[PDB]
Amino acid sequence: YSYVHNITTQTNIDLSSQQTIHLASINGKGYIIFLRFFCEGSSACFTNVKFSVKANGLVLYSFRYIQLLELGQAIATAIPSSSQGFSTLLSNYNVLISSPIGTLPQLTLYDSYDNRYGAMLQPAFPLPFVNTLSLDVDILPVSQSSYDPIPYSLNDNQISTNAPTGKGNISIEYLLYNCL
Amino acid sequence: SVTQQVFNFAVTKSQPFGGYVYSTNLTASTSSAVTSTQLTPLNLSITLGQITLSGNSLVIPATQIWYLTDAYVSVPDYTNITNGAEADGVILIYKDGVKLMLTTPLISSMSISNPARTHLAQAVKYSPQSILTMYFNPTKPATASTSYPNTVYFTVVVVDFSYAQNPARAVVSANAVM
Amino acid sequence: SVTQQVFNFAVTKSQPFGGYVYSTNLTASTSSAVTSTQLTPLNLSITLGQITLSGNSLVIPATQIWYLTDAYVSVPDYTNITNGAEADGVILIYKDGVKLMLTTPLISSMSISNPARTHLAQAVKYSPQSILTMYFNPTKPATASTSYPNTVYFTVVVVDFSYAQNPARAVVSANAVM
Amino acid sequence: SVTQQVFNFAVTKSQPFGGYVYSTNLTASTSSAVTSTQLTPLNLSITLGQITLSGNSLVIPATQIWYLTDAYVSVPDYTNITNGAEADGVILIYKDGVKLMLTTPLISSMSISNPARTHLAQAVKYSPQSILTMYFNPTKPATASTSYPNTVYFTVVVVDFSYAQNPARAVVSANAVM
Amino acid sequence: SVTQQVFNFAVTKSQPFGGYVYSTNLTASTSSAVTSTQLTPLNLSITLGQITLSGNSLVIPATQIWYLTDAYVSVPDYTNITNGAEADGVILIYKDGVKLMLTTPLISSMSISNPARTHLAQAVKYSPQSILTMYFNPTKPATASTSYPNTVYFTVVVVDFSYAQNPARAVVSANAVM
Amino acid sequence: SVTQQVFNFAVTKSQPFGGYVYSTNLTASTSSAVTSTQLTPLNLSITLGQITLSGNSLVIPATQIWYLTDAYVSVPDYTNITNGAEADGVILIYKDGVKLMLTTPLISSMSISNPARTHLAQAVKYSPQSILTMYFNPTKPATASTSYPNTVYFTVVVVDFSYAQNPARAVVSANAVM
Amino acid sequence: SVTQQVFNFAVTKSQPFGGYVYSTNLTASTSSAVTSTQLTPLNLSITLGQITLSGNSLVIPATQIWYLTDAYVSVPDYTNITNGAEADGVILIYKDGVKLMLTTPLISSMSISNPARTHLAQAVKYSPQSILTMYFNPTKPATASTSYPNTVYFTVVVVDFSYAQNPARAVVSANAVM
């Protein structure tokens, strides 16, 4: 067996309507051990980019950053009732950091000033994958205003008409333990 | 100078299976005036059907075996490298994202006006689906004002198998012999 | 020494069947100031009996085997390319309109004023009667005013069987032996 | 082709034991405008996994075998030497701090633009972990104002064993034969 | 080395019959500043004894076999070509005035200073009595004032048989063999 | 390039009879600025005896076997050829005042600054007493005012036999095998 | 690639007896501005332990075998020769004082700034102790004021035996097989 540690990149991405980008692909059996997902560029990293991790064609993970914040996998907050919810959170705070993870991913880095976003993932036991492991990024522009974060299927391609846009660059770090 | 030996190695070995050998042009270009650290050039290949594979990290299609053989730098770049208008350095050639396979010897020495133009040591094989990635490691970076991005062209020999009797069941049997 | 290898290969293979092997200069001229998109070049070949086979999409005569071996660009073109008077780019070489066989690497870099001119990958053969069409795919087009057409000279080895005692079937019979 | 004989030697010997061969570029740069006496250049290689072995006296990793095959000097450095802006001299190549193994013939003479450039004398094998250090003994030092540091590139063919089955007994059985 | 294989073949084959193999230089000179159309260049061959067989259509005498091996152009000739001070074009090489065998690839391109100089296609054998003649077909002719004539150098291998015995029997036996 | 093979050939062959093999430098120089026609260069060879053999028509001494190998032309001569301050042309090499054995390829094109410096075809043997004489046949003679004489340096391999038991008997056995 | 052929030949024959093959630099310098006649240059070689063997006529140490394989002349010496600030000429290579081994062809013509500089004729071997001495026989002496002494660099392949089992008489066993 051997460790496989790598960083894959796409350095100039249009965050426009309905693109599908295939970042990296790994052959062979192994165990997922550590994952990190990063986006930089305009603020359109936060809402429009959906990360996906598949093993043998079967979907393991699929998420966004605003899905990780709005479904509570982020820094623990508590908002007074005389507010507008999350619209009062992202409008007032610039940088949000949160360290402890477990198996499900967490929004570890929110940086609206420097405009860097990131999430991490550490399984509590090594997650096996048999045939291939694939990493995908889907650009689906959806505004912050509604988005309906409670999921109803895996393949929900939801968009809006006044979503923010721009250019940005997307990186994924992974550490696996493959076979020979 | 290694292209003519790997070409006849492709025309002899692939023809019992059906083998359609041709050459295409690959372009690597780091954007926006590298001046400090290790940069990432944007790959760009041009295959048959007006298919422009772009961005980083090209994937070889499922019926082809590529061969990255040679490289050269044009004269309007080489007059800028010696004037310090763009960075010198080498280009690292990766296969499957972790394995480093070659290093291009000092792209100012790959100019088309050097009477001793340096070539590559050996051409690198790229099987069906396998990620090709490159990086630019600058030694003597750009110091002058109004700098320019780098551009280093390559040369790919493609061994196609789509026009045999079977596109999939035959390429995976010539991949073992080449 | 790539022309002399395929010339000497032809004059020992087509010699027991009778073959008049000679050299010919081919011209490929994209007309009237290519400025935006993909163009089509006017071919021009001057065979033995002073007849100039012209126009786009040359049909090869039925008793000959052609070998397109080299490519170069004259010096007054290279002054016009780098000064933006005529367009740069590559050249695609077909056969019967479907089979793509080469891509010439950036005709500004195939110039003869440089001492390390780049070459083709392999001398491309061409059977008895079979359509030869070319195309010009411009990158960084002509920018300055008072532009000029492009012209890229080739070099073709023509094996000829017309003066033997045998029809256009013995030409293709001694074609597949090669 | 002295690198191409080393490259053919490593891929035949280290292949039955399981073994990865590639080439990289090592950059030895004497710092800050040598004008008086013997100095020491800072070696800086870029190995496989994004790592940068910098500083004097590079120690080889415990799973890699190196081969110092060739050396040259870039053309903007050769312009500065003959104009007297940076120093000439020899470069001594040591192993384990004890053996003097080679002495490069006068680094102004090995510029890459000359086809009649004298190369390194012989390809030097460097075992797993063992000190590689270099010294720069100048003659005709730098005289002109606004002087520049020196930079001499080297070509290293690197054999790697990090993807074998049992790499403890894979290295020490392949290092003995090769 | 295309003259050396022809030379060693002539030395080996003509030795048992008695034969004197040596090498000379031939000068093809298109006089008086070609400006419009197809001209005829003056041949001048220097045999043993400052004979200088001059003028058009040199007849090979009945004891010798000539081998037109290589062709080049001088460096001020290349400079006057690329400045438009003398005309560019091709040179057609005939046997007995009817049979075309070779066309020189654009005599601007075969300058002796470039290492990437394109050679002649093949060494043309001229048997006993037989008429060598050449023609100069110009493309992009001379434009500047004070234009110069054209001069193209050839390298001939002459295999003489006059000193051996009765030279006619030796000539027919050697020309049957080689 | 041929001087290293005939040197090793002379060492291995003159050893069973006993003999020096070494090298010297032969200077041919046409006097006083040739502008018209066939001129005779003044040879000047100096051997180990500090004995100068000058003038035309040098005689090989009775215990030596010479070998004329290569030639070169220095840079202030080639600066004057390209300005027309001295003549171009070839140099004919005779033996015994009768035979003609080589014709050197265009003395401008073997200048030491041409990156494709051309060498001679094969080394010329010279037995005991024989007359080495040269003749300079100018093409493109000197046209500019204040012209300069020509100078072409040669390289001679000298096989002396003076230290054998009987040197006059040793050479006539070694001239047969060499 | 001539020094790398005798280097590889030395390590093949010193391998069964033990031997420490390495390359150094010998620097021959004529003192104080030669202007009239034949002078004597003072050799200066560098062996392992910072040992500077100076003075005329270096004596080979008792357990080493030397190989003089290369010579070159630096660029500030070549710009002083052509300016007439130091003398041109040749250099004689003597063994034991008695034998003449070589003569370097006209040291200005083996400068390193010329892309096709001339070479020596052979690598002269040197046994356990022999008196290696040199002599500089000048032509076209120093004419301009403020003249400079000559400096001509060499390259020695040194075969030490001092780290074998007995470097007194194992060195005389490998002297015969080489």
DSSP letter assigned to residue A130: -
Q: What is the DSSP string of C43-95?
A: EEEE-TTS-EEEESSEEPPTTEEEEEEEEEB-HHHHHHHHTTSS--EEEEE-S
CA distance F47 to G100: 11
Number of Cβ within 10 Å of residue E100's Cβ equals 19
> Do the beta carbons of residue C55 and residue C43 sit within 8 Å?
yes
Residue G97 phi, psi dihedral angles, 5° rounding:
75, -20
Residues of B in contact with D117 (CB under 8 A): 116
Euclidean distance between the first and the last CA atom of chain G, given in angstroms as a whole number:
19
Token look-up 């006044």 returns A162
- For residue B4, give both structure tokens: 């003519």
Helix (H, G, I), strand (E, B) or coil at E44: strand
Q: What are the CA-CA distances from residue D177 to residues D10, D13, D18, D22, G14 (Å)?
A: 11, 8, 14, 19, 19
User: How big is chain B, counted in residues?
Assistant: 178
Closest CA to D178 of D3, D12, D1: D12
- For residue E140, give both structure tokens: 């992009």
User: How big is chain G, counted in residues?
Assistant: 178
HSE, CB side, 13 Å, CA atoms: give it for residue B169.
2
Query: Under an 8 Å CB criterion, which residues of C touch E?
Result: 1, 3-4, 7-8, 11, 22-25, 48, 70, 72, 74-76, 112-117, 153, 155, 157
What is the tally of structural domains in chain C? 1
Q: What are the CA-CA distances from residue D126 to residues D20, D123, G16, G86 (Å)?
A: 16, 10, 21, 44
With an 8 Å CB cutoff and a minimum of 3 pairs, decide whether chains A and C touch: no
Calculate the CA dihedral of residues D100, D102, D103, D104 and round it to 10 degrees: -150
- For residue F56, give both structure tokens: 């035309």
CA distance G155 to D110: 14
- For residue D123, give both structure tokens: 């390809």
Yes or no, beta carbons of D4 and B122 under 8 Å apart: yes
In sequence order, what are the residues at sequence separation of 6 or more whose Cβ sits closer than 8 angstroms to the Cβ of residue A143?
A: A47, A160, A161, A162, A163, A164
In sequence order, what are the residues at sequence separation of 6 or more whose Cβ sits closer than 8 angstroms to the Cβ of residue C84?
A: C142, C143, C144
> Do the beta carbons of residue F77 and residue F88 sit within 8 Å?
no
Nearest chain E residue to C73 by CA distance is: E109
Residue in C82, C100, C115 nearest the CB of B76: C82
Closest CA to D90 of G153, C26, A17: G153
Residue in G99, G108, G116 nearest the CB of F113: G116
Q: What is the DSSP string of chain F?
A: -THHHHHHHHHHHHTTT----EEE-EEEEE-S---SS-B-EEEEEE-TTS-EE-SSSEEPPTTEEEEEEEEEB-HHHHHHHTTTSS---EEEEEETTTEEEEE-S-TTTTBTT-TT----SSPEEE-SS-EEEEEEE-SS---SSS-----EEEEEEEEE-TTSSSHHHHHHHHHHH-
CA distance F75 to F97: 32
Does the CA dihedral D107-D108-D112-D116 come out positive or negative?
negative
Residue in B57, B59, B98 nearest the CB of A4: B98
CA distance G39 to B82: 43
Please state whether beta strands F41-46 and G152-160 pair in parallel, antiparallel, or not at all (unpaired): unpaired
CA distance A12 to A28: 30
Yes or no, beta carbons of E105 and C23 under 8 Å apart: yes
In sequence order, what are the residues at sequence separation of 6 or more whose Cβ sits closer than 8 angstroms to the Cβ of residue B18?
A: B161, B163, B164, B165, B170
Which of D80, D111, D118 would you mutate first to test chain G, the one with the most G CBs within 10 A? D118
Yes or no, beta carbons of D106 and G4 under 8 Å apart: no
The secondary element (H helix, E strand) that includes residue D76 is helix D75-82
Experimental method: cryo-EM
> Do the beta carbons of residue D133 and residue D97 sit within 8 Å?
yes
Beta pairing partners, B102:
B93
Helix (H, G, I), strand (E, B) or coil at D13: helix
In sequence order, what are the residues at sequence separation of 6 or more whose Cβ sits closer than 8 angstroms to the Cβ of residue D88?
A: D81, D106, D107, D108, D138, D139, D140, D141, G74
- For residue F64, give both structure tokens: 């030596």
Helix (H, G, I), strand (E, B) or coil at A27: strand
Reported for A114-118, long-range contacts at CB under 8 A and 24+ positions apart, including other chains, are A115/A40, A115/A41, A115/A42, A115/A43, A115/A45, A116/A38, A116/A39, A116/A40, A117/A38, A117/A39, A117/A40, A117/A45, A117/A46, A117/A65, A118/A36, A118/A37, A118/A38, A118/A39
The secondary element (H helix, E strand) that includes residue C3 is helix C3-13
CA distance A51 to A121: 13
Token look-up 């200066």 returns G44
- Identify residue A177 by its one-letter amino acid code: Y
Number of Cβ within 10 Å of residue A85's Cβ equals 9
Helix (H, G, I), strand (E, B) or coil at E45: strand
CA distance G81 to G62: 38
CA distance F133 to F45: 12
CA distance D22 to A47: 42
Which of C3, C100, C106, C143 would you mutate first to test chain B, the one with the most B CBs within 10 A? C100
Query: Where are the extended beta strands (E) located within chain E?
Result: 20-30, 42-45, 53-54, 58-59, 65-72, 88-95, 99-103, 124-126, 131-139, 150-160
The secondary element (H helix, E strand) that includes residue D41 is strand D41-46
In sequence order, what are the residues at sequence separation of 6 or more whose Cβ sits closer than 8 angstroms to the Cβ of residue A60?
A: A53, A54, A127, A129
CA distance A178 to D69: 34
CA distance D126 to D64: 9
CA distance C13 to A114: 71
**Angle (nearest 5°) at CA E11 between E8 and E17:** 150
CA distance D60 to D68: 12
Helix (H, G, I), strand (E, B) or coil at C172: helix
Q: What are the CA-CA distances from residue G40 to residues G57, G87, G94, G100, G141 (Å)?
A: 10, 13, 12, 15, 15
Number of Cβ within 10 Å of residue G122's Cβ equals 20
Residue C162: which domain range?
1-178
Nearest chain C Cα distance for residue E99, angstroms: 9
CA distance C42 to F6: 54
**Angle (nearest 5°) at CA C47 between C41 and C51:** 85
Closest CA to B114 of D115, C120, D109, D3: D115
Helix, strand, coil percentages, rounded to 5, for chain A: 10, 45, 45
**Angle (nearest 5°) at CA B148 between C78 and C109:** 25
In sequence order, what are the residues at sequence separation of 6 or more whose Cβ sits closer than 8 angstroms to the Cβ of residue F42?
A: F28, F29, F30, F31, F54, F55, F56
- For residue D66, give both structure tokens: 């190196």
In terms of Cβ atoms closer than 10 Å to its own Cβ (0-12, 13-18, 19+), residue A153 is: exposed
- Chain D touching partners, 3 or more CB pairs below 8 A: A, B, G
Residue C107 phi, psi dihedral angles, 5° rounding:
-45, -20
Residue in B7, B72, B153 nearest the CB of C121: B7
In sequence order, what are the residues at sequence separation of 6 or more whose Cβ sits closer than 8 angstroms to the Cβ of residue G78?
A: G108, G111, G112, G113
Yes or no, beta carbons of F22 and G90 under 8 Å apart: no
> Do the beta carbons of residue B12 and residue B21 sit within 8 Å?
no
Residues of C in contact with E115 (CB under 8 A): 115-116
Nearest chain E Cα distance for residue C75, angstroms: 6
Nearest chain D residue to B118 by CA distance is: D112
CA distance B174 to E175: 49
Number of Cβ within 10 Å of residue F57's Cβ equals 13
Gyration radius (Cα) of chain C, Å: 17
Residue G157 phi, psi dihedral angles, 5° rounding:
-90, 115
CA distance A29 to A177: 9
3-state secondary structure chain G: CCHHHHHHHHHHHCCCCCCEEEEECCEEEECCCCCCCCECEECCEECCCCCEECCCCEECCCCEEEEEEEEEECHHHHHHHCCCCCCEEEEEEEECCCEEEEEECCHHHHECCCCCCCCCCCCEEECCCCEEEEEEEEECCCCCCCCCCCCEEEEEEEEECCCCCCCCCCCCCHHHHC
In terms of Cβ atoms closer than 10 Å to its own Cβ (0-12, 13-18, 19+), residue D128 is: middle
- For residue C105, give both structure tokens: 């690497």
CA distance B119 to B69: 9
CA distance A117 to A66: 11
> What's the reported resolution, in angstroms, to a tenth?
3.7
HSE, CB side, 13 Å, CA atoms: give it for residue D49.
9
CA distance F68 to G177: 31
Nearest chain B Cα distance for residue C169, angstroms: 24
> Do the beta carbons of residue F108 and residue E75 sit within 8 Å?
yes
CA distance F131 to C137: 64
Nearest chain F Cα distance for residue E147, angstroms: 15
Calculate the CA dihedral of residues F133, F137, F141, F147 and round it to 10 degrees: 0
In Å, the largest CA–CA distance within chain A is 59
**Angle (nearest 5°) at CA E99 between E93 and E104:** 25
Residues of D in contact with B100 (CB under 8 A): 22, 24, 47-49
Q: What are the CA-CA distances from residue E14 to residues E167, E168, E177, E178 (Å)?
A: 12, 14, 9, 8
Nearest chain F residue to G135 by CA distance is: F48
CA distance E121 to C11: 12
- For residue D156, give both structure tokens: 């290293």
Yes or no, beta carbons of F109 and E114 under 8 Å apart: no
- Identify residue B84 by its one-letter amino acid code: G
Gyration radius (Cα) of chain D, Å: 17
> Do the beta carbons of residue F106 and residue E25 sit within 8 Å?
yes
Residue in G11, G20, G115 nearest the CB of D116: G115
Residues of D in contact with B114 (CB under 8 A): 75, 112-113
Reported for C46-49, long-range contacts at CB under 8 A and 24+ positions apart, including other chains, are C47/C158, C48/C22, C48/C160, C48/E100
HSE, CB side, 13 Å, CA atoms: give it for residue F111.
22
Q: What are the CA-CA distances from residue E167 to residues B138, C91, E63, E162, E178 (Å)?
A: 71, 55, 6, 6, 16
Q: What are the CA-CA distances from residue D67 to residues D3, D133, D154, D159, D178 (Å)?
A: 9, 14, 10, 8, 11
> Do the beta carbons of residue D30 and residue D147 sit within 8 Å?
no
Residue in F4, F76, F153 nearest the CB of G82: F76
Residue E172 phi, psi dihedral angles, 5° rounding:
-70, -35
